[PDB]
Design an enzyme around this catalytic site. Sequence first.
Site, PDB file in Angstrom:
ATOM      1  N   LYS A   1     -54.512  64.408  98.250  1.00 28.55           N
ATOM      2  CA  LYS A   1     -53.987  63.377  99.138  1.00 28.55           C
ATOM      3  C   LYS A   1     -52.880  62.564  98.480  1.00 28.55           C
ATOM      4  O   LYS A   1     -51.942  62.135  99.162  1.00 28.55           O
ATOM      5  CB  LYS A   1     -55.116  62.450  99.596  1.00 28.55           C
ATOM      6  CG  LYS A   1     -55.706  62.813 100.945  1.00 28.55           C
ATOM      7  CD  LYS A   1     -57.065  62.170 101.182  1.00 28.55           C
ATOM      8  CE  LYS A   1     -57.770  62.826 102.364  1.00 28.55           C
ATOM      9  NZ  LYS A   1     -59.100  62.227 102.663  1.00 28.55           N
TER      10      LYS A   1
ATOM     11  N   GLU B   1     -63.382  68.098  84.747  1.00 26.69           N
ATOM     12  CA  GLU B   1     -63.985  69.397  84.490  1.00 26.69           C
ATOM     13  C   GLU B   1     -63.406  70.434  85.445  1.00 26.69           C
ATOM     14  O   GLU B   1     -63.358  70.215  86.659  1.00 26.69           O
ATOM     15  CB  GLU B   1     -65.501  69.312  84.652  1.00 26.69           C
ATOM     16  CG  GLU B   1     -66.206  70.655  84.705  1.00 26.69           C
ATOM     17  CD  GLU B   1     -67.674  70.527  85.067  1.00 26.69           C
ATOM     18  OE1 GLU B   1     -68.073  69.462  85.587  1.00 26.69           O
ATOM     19  OE2 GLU B   1     -68.430  71.491  84.827  1.00 26.69           O
ATOM     20  N   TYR B   2     -62.964  71.564  84.898  1.00 25.90           N
ATOM     21  CA  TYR B   2     -62.383  72.620  85.715  1.00 25.90           C
ATOM     22  C   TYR B   2     -63.480  73.449  86.369  1.00 25.90           C
ATOM     23  O   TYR B   2     -64.397  73.927  85.693  1.00 25.90           O
ATOM     24  CB  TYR B   2     -61.475  73.518  84.874  1.00 25.90           C
ATOM     25  CG  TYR B   2     -61.039  74.780  85.589  1.00 25.90           C
ATOM     26  CD1 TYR B   2     -60.222  74.719  86.711  1.00 25.90           C
ATOM     27  CD2 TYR B   2     -61.444  76.031  85.142  1.00 25.90           C
ATOM     28  CE1 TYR B   2     -59.822  75.869  87.369  1.00 25.90           C
ATOM     29  CE2 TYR B   2     -61.046  77.187  85.793  1.00 25.90           C
ATOM     30  CZ  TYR B   2     -60.237  77.099  86.906  1.00 25.90           C
ATOM     31  OH  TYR B   2     -59.841  78.246  87.556  1.00 25.90           O
ATOM     32  N   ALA B   3     -63.381  73.621  87.685  1.00 22.03           N
ATOM     33  CA  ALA B   3     -64.316  74.451  88.434  1.00 22.03           C
ATOM     34  C   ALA B   3     -63.637  75.763  88.801  1.00 22.03           C
ATOM     35  O   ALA B   3     -62.710  75.765  89.627  1.00 22.03           O
ATOM     36  CB  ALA B   3     -64.799  73.727  89.690  1.00 22.03           C
TER      37      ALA B   3
ATOM     38  N   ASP C   1     -70.149  59.910 102.598  1.00 19.93           N
ATOM     39  CA  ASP C   1     -70.072  61.163 103.339  1.00 19.93           C
ATOM     40  C   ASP C   1     -69.675  62.306 102.411  1.00 19.93           C
ATOM     41  O   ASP C   1     -68.860  62.136 101.501  1.00 19.93           O
ATOM     42  CB  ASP C   1     -69.076  61.036 104.495  1.00 19.93           C
ATOM     43  CG  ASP C   1     -67.630  60.968 104.026  1.00 19.93           C
ATOM     44  OD1 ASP C   1     -66.957  62.022 104.017  1.00 19.93           O
ATOM     45  OD2 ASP C   1     -67.167  59.865 103.664  1.00 19.93           O
TER      46      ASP C   1
ATOM     47  N   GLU D   1     -65.415  70.659 101.606  1.00 15.87           N
ATOM     48  CA  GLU D   1     -64.173  70.724 100.849  1.00 15.87           C
ATOM     49  C   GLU D   1     -64.236  69.920  99.558  1.00 15.87           C
ATOM     50  O   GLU D   1     -63.433  70.165  98.651  1.00 15.87           O
ATOM     51  CB  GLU D   1     -63.006  70.232 101.709  1.00 15.87           C
ATOM     52  CG  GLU D   1     -62.763  71.045 102.977  1.00 15.87           C
ATOM     53  CD  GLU D   1     -63.645  70.622 104.143  1.00 15.87           C
ATOM     54  OE1 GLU D   1     -64.538  69.770 103.948  1.00 15.87           O
ATOM     55  OE2 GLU D   1     -63.439  71.144 105.261  1.00 15.87           O
TER      56      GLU D   1
ATOM     57  N   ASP E   1     -65.620  64.453  94.455  1.00 14.90           N
ATOM     58  CA  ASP E   1     -64.866  63.405  95.126  1.00 14.90           C
ATOM     59  C   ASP E   1     -65.190  62.079  94.452  1.00 14.90           C
ATOM     60  O   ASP E   1     -66.014  62.010  93.534  1.00 14.90           O
ATOM     61  CB  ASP E   1     -65.156  63.377  96.635  1.00 14.90           C
ATOM     62  CG  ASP E   1     -66.629  63.193  96.951  1.00 14.90           C
ATOM     63  OD1 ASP E   1     -67.444  63.082  96.012  1.00 14.90           O
ATOM     64  OD2 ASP E   1     -66.973  63.163  98.152  1.00 14.90           O
TER      65      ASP E   1
HETATM   66  C1  LIG Z   1     -58.454  66.736 102.087  1.00 19.88           C
HETATM   67  C2  LIG Z   1     -57.029  66.995 101.531  1.00 19.88           C
HETATM   68  C3  LIG Z   1     -56.038  66.000 102.184  1.00 19.88           C
HETATM   69  C4  LIG Z   1     -57.053  66.696 100.035  1.00 19.88           C
HETATM   70  O1  LIG Z   1     -57.786  65.528  99.758  1.00 19.88           O
HETATM   71  P1  LIG Z   1     -58.146  65.137  98.186  1.00 19.88           P
HETATM   72  O2  LIG Z   1     -59.353  64.231  98.155  1.00 19.88           O
HETATM   73  O3  LIG Z   1     -56.974  64.424  97.546  1.00 19.88           O
HETATM   74  O4  LIG Z   1     -58.454  66.542  97.357  1.00 19.88           O
HETATM   75  P2  LIG Z   1     -58.284  66.714  95.715  1.00 19.88           P
HETATM   76  O5  LIG Z   1     -57.052  65.972  95.242  1.00 19.88           O
HETATM   77  O6  LIG Z   1     -59.507  66.163  95.031  1.00 19.88           O
HETATM   78  O7  LIG Z   1     -58.111  68.307  95.328  1.00 19.88           O
HETATM   79  C5  LIG Z   1     -57.000  69.010  95.824  1.00 19.88           C
HETATM   80  C6  LIG Z   1     -57.030  70.460  95.331  1.00 19.88           C
HETATM   81  O8  LIG Z   1     -57.239  70.506  94.031  1.00 19.88           O
HETATM   82  C7  LIG Z   1     -58.633  71.356  93.767  1.00 19.88           C
HETATM   83  N1  LIG Z   1     -59.309  70.807  92.630  1.00 19.88           N
HETATM   84  C8  LIG Z   1     -59.464  69.498  92.389  1.00 19.88           C
HETATM   85  N2  LIG Z   1     -60.148  69.357  91.238  1.00 19.88           N
HETATM   86  C9  LIG Z   1     -60.417  70.585  90.765  1.00 19.88           C
HETATM   87  C10 LIG Z   1     -61.087  71.006  89.630  1.00 19.88           C
HETATM   88  N3  LIG Z   1     -61.724  70.236  88.568  1.00 19.88           N
HETATM   89  N4  LIG Z   1     -61.225  72.307  89.378  1.00 19.88           N
HETATM   90  C11 LIG Z   1     -60.702  73.219  90.247  1.00 19.88           C
HETATM   91  N5  LIG Z   1     -60.042  72.808  91.368  1.00 19.88           N
HETATM   92  C12 LIG Z   1     -59.901  71.488  91.623  1.00 19.88           C
HETATM   93  C13 LIG Z   1     -59.337  71.237  94.890  1.00 19.88           C
HETATM   94  O9  LIG Z   1     -60.238  72.380  95.074  1.00 19.88           O
HETATM   95  C14 LIG Z   1     -58.233  71.246  95.982  1.00 19.88           C
HETATM   96  O10 LIG Z   1     -57.861  72.501  96.203  1.00 19.88           O
HETATM   97  P3  LIG Z   1     -57.600  73.031  97.743  1.00 19.88           P
HETATM   98  O11 LIG Z   1     -56.648  72.089  98.453  1.00 19.88           O
HETATM   99  O12 LIG Z   1     -57.002  74.420  97.672  1.00 19.88           O
HETATM  100  O13 LIG Z   1     -58.908  73.083  98.481  1.00 19.88           O
HETATM  101  C15 LIG Z   1     -56.533  68.494 101.689  1.00 19.88           C
HETATM  102  O14 LIG Z   1     -57.611  69.279 101.367  1.00 19.88           O
HETATM  103  C16 LIG Z   1     -55.975  69.014 103.043  1.00 19.88           C
HETATM  104  O15 LIG Z   1     -55.262  68.378 103.746  1.00 19.88           O
HETATM  105  N6  LIG Z   1     -56.309  70.408 103.505  1.00 19.88           N
HETATM  106  C17 LIG Z   1     -55.744  70.888 104.795  1.00 19.88           C
HETATM  107  C18 LIG Z   1     -56.427  70.337 106.094  1.00 19.88           C
HETATM  108  C19 LIG Z   1     -56.974  71.583 106.817  1.00 19.88           C
HETATM  109  O16 LIG Z   1     -56.260  72.504 107.008  1.00 19.88           O
HETATM  110  N7  LIG Z   1     -58.377  71.659 107.288  1.00 19.88           N
HETATM  111  C20 LIG Z   1     -59.325  70.538 107.080  1.00 19.88           C
HETATM  112  C21 LIG Z   1     -59.258  69.414 108.135  1.00 19.88           C
HETATM  113  S1  LIG Z   1     -58.894  67.779 107.391  1.00 19.88           S
END
Ligand SMILES: CC(C)(COP(=O)(O)OP(=O)(O)OC[C@H]1O[C@@H](n2cnc3c(N)ncnc32)[C@H](O)[C@@H]1OP(=O)(O)O)[C@@H](O)C(=O)NCCC(=O)NCCS
Lengths: 252, 252
Positions: free
Chosen positions: B17, B85-87, B130, B134, B148
């Site tokens: 985000k 931590e990397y997942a 919540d 994702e 999160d």
């Molecule tokens: C929710 C959203 C805005 C991001 O919110 P966020 O809280 O900032 O998410 P994060 O910054 O924690 O993580 C972003 C990416 O880094 C990945 N990531 C974060 N930390 C990680 C870690 N330690 N290890 C591996 N991957 C990681 C996450 O899996 C995510 O990957 P993805 O987008 O391919 O799923 C975004 O997911 C989105 O807009 N997706 C598209 C919307 C959609 O098409 N459908 C859902 C309806 S809302």
Amino acid sequence: QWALEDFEIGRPLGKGKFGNVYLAREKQSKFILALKVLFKAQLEKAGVEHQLRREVEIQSHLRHPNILRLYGYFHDATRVYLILEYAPLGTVYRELQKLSKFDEQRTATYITELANALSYCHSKRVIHRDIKPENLLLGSAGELKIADFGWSVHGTLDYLPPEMIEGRMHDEKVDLWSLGVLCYEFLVGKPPFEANTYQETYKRISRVEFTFPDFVTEGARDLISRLLKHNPSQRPMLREVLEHPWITANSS
Amino acid sequence: QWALEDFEIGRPLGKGKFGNVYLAREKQSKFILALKVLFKAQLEKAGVEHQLRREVEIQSHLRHPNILRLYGYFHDATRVYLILEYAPLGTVYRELQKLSKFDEQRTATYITELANALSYCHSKRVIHRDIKPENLLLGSAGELKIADFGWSVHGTLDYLPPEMIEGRMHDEKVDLWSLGVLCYEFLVGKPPFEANTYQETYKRISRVEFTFPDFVTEGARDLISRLLKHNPSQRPMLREVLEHPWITANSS
Ligand SMILES: CC(C)(COP(=O)(O)OP(=O)(O)OC[C@H]1O[C@@H](n2cnc3c(N)ncnc32)[C@H](O)[C@@H]1OP(=O)(O)O)[C@@H](O)C(=O)NCCC(=O)NCCS
Ligand SMILES: CC(C)(COP(=O)(O)OP(=O)(O)OC[C@H]1O[C@@H](n2cnc3c(N)ncnc32)[C@H](O)[C@@H]1OP(=O)(O)O)[C@@H](O)C(=O)NCCC(=O)NCCS
């Protein structure tokens, strides 16, 4: 369009949280009113300018003899002006200091006037919050007037519980707790949960721990005990307060 | 003191985000981790920089195998860096897309891992809000990790009702609604209140209007129906979920 040019400024009525209140007179009509000046500088830095504008629009449409009338409003570079109904007899808080405590007729009449204004707003989808004696002004005929701004009008979702998408807090049920606290203070002279420290007052509100002096009649005790319910949903409706036997027997 | 000088930046894991996430390696230890870069410019203008700092301090002390580990953090002129931590196995949401729907063993094991992490935080006076699929990452051993920031640690008064000085909203009872929504979606493939429009989903959450496909067993229906209570106080405790017969019979 209102302007400061339209008013003659007189003696100051007092100082508020964000400005001053003056006795004023409209130049064309020679009508006496109160001009509340609020400085946008301390309104914006207190983070209440957005809250205030919403509360002013709601109050601008409220017309009730027991609600302080907001005629209009205007602003300039640094100030916001509220054209308000002038209340000549001061606050109920100060009258409670002058009389030490009220009798049953004045108390029941005050509760009747408060409950009428709140039921009027209830029908107008307007809800009022906490009510203090300091926010209650008295008109020329001795009737009280609510004189604060505490008015209100009221994809991810798949994972939210009902307690986060519904309602929720808080309905027109805090004003009923206020009627219980006010009715007690009017008859007794002190709020029912006043204590020597902060946490003791906090505890006695949390457990609803209050007692009646020996001069409080059973009719007043019955009304106060039903208003002061820890469960909001078990507090009466505003119609039950207006129909309560102690109210209907003592109200003017 | 951490610094960007200490890490080797690799491929980007995705965009969030308020920034981006990169695979990184600590230069001295050669330890693989994820570096989440959050731009203070869009954090401050979204009004979440204060909220984020509180959520980062809470997460920095949480150590649980089913919670994504926050090792440390640092900042510069315009960015904030989170050493995470990397997942390697991605999100549960994407795994649910790959498998269409989960079986009873994987679902009960996921619920067991979620309930353990939440009960761990419950003992550490930490409450989670919540939970979305994702926001659930998978470690190298297939265990899920909550990834999160939704963590939390928890004169005038004479006239305030109990519903304004107490509590109040909301306790560690929304996570139990989340376990019901997640357990349903894991077994079915769709959230239980998904609808064609906004207000229909809103209504079915408000009335708790959900049904089970014919392939959902009675043990899973019993767990989901007890978690999905409109009354939060009637949802089980996290220990009852871990002791539920369907969980204890199917969890790995
Ligand atoms: C929710 C959203 C805005 C991001 O919110 P966020 O809280 O900032 O998410 P994060 O910054 O924690 O993580 C972003 C990416 O880094 C990945 N990531 C974060 N930390 C990680 C870690 N330690 N290890 C591996 N991957 C990681 C996450 O899996 C995510 O990957 P993805 O987008 O391919 O799923 C975004 O997911 C989105 O807009 N997706 C598209 C919307 C959609 O098409 N459908 C859902 C309806 S809302
Ligand atoms: C509460 C307080 C901060 C002011 O808050 P506020 O919401 O801004 O109050 P307002 O701006 O609406 O009104 C301020 C003055 O103008 C008066 N006033 C406002 N509108 C009026 C009107 N139409 N007609 C006549 N008078 C009016 C009010 O009676 C008040 O006078 P007062 O201070 O002598 O009682 C202030 O009352 C205070 O600090 N008092 C001292 C605290 C104390 O000693 N005891 C109470 C414990 S908090």
